[PDB]
Design a protein around this motif. Structure first.
Motif, mmCIF file in Angstrom:
data_model
loop_
_atom_site.group_PDB
_atom_site.id
_atom_site.type_symbol
_atom_site.label_atom_id
_atom_site.label_comp_id
_atom_site.label_asym_id
_atom_site.label_seq_id
_atom_site.Cartn_x
_atom_site.Cartn_y
_atom_site.Cartn_z
ATOM 1 N N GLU A 124 -0.851 11.756 14.910
ATOM 2 C CA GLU A 124 -1.590 12.978 14.740
ATOM 3 C C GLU A 124 -3.093 12.765 14.887
ATOM 4 O O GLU A 124 -3.824 13.614 15.434
ATOM 5 N N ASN A 125 -3.656 11.690 14.343
ATOM 6 C CA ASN A 125 -5.082 11.468 14.510
ATOM 7 C C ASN A 125 -5.380 9.989 14.318
ATOM 8 O O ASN A 125 -4.517 9.222 13.875
ATOM 9 N N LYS A 126 -6.585 9.617 14.832
ATOM 10 C CA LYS A 126 -7.045 8.233 14.995
ATOM 11 C C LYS A 126 -5.972 7.430 15.712
ATOM 12 O O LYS A 126 -5.506 6.375 15.315
ATOM 13 N N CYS A 127 -5.544 7.963 16.869
ATOM 14 C CA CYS A 127 -4.417 7.424 17.617
ATOM 15 C C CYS A 127 -4.921 6.491 18.696
ATOM 16 O O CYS A 127 -6.085 6.576 19.106
ATOM 17 N N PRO A 148 -14.341 6.638 15.975
ATOM 18 C CA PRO A 148 -13.200 6.913 16.825
ATOM 19 C C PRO A 148 -12.189 5.776 16.739
ATOM 20 O O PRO A 148 -12.536 4.660 16.331
ATOM 21 N N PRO A 149 -10.916 5.940 17.078
ATOM 22 C CA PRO A 149 -9.960 4.861 17.139
ATOM 23 C C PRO A 149 -10.181 3.862 18.273
ATOM 24 O O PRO A 149 -11.013 4.109 19.143
ATOM 25 N N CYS A 150 -9.461 2.754 18.251
ATOM 26 C CA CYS A 150 -9.388 1.842 19.362
ATOM 27 C C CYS A 150 -7.930 1.917 19.740
ATOM 28 O O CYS A 150 -7.108 2.446 18.991
ATOM 29 N N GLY A 151 -7.570 1.415 20.904
ATOM 30 C CA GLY A 151 -6.240 1.483 21.451
ATOM 31 C C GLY A 151 -5.395 0.400 20.875
ATOM 32 O O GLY A 151 -5.808 -0.345 19.977
#
Length: 89
Positions: free
Chosen positions: A36-39, A56-59
Motif C-alpha cells: 500500500e505505501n513505501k513500496c 521515499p522508499p528504496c526498491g
C-alpha cells in the motif's frame, strides 16, 4: 505494527512497507504487489532518499544510505552506512 488505511493512517516505523492489509514488513507480501505505501515500486528515478526528499522508499534489496541515496550492498545497507530499509542493518 499497523499502518495505512487499515491501521489509522500511520507510516511504518523504520520506513518499512505497509501492506494493503495494514501491517508493516520488508518482504514481497508487504513491499511488492500487495503493498500500500513505501513500496519497492516507489523509489525515485534519481534514487534520492532520506528526509530531504520526504523519506521515499528504496526498491527491492536496496537501502537508503546515510548520504541520502538508495543502493545495494555494504555502502548502502550495512551498519553505519544505512539510515533506513537496511537489508543487513
Amino acid at each position: 505494527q499497523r499502518c495505512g488505511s487499515q491501521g489509522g493512517g500511520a507510516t511504518c516505523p523504520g520506513l518499512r512497507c505497509c501492506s494493503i492489509w495494514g501491517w508493516c514488513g520488508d518482504s514481497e507480501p508487504y513491499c511488492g504487489r500487495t503493498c500500500e505505501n513505501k513500496c519497492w515500486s516507489g523509489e525515485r528515478s534519481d534514487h534520492r532518499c532520506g528526509a530531504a526528499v520526504g523519506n521515499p522508499p528504496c526498491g527491492q534489496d536496496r537501502c537508503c544510505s546515510v548520504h541520502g541515496w538508495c543502493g545495494g550492498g555494504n555502502d548502502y545497507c550495512s551498519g553505519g552506512k544505512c539510515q533506513y530499509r537496511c537489508s543487513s542493518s
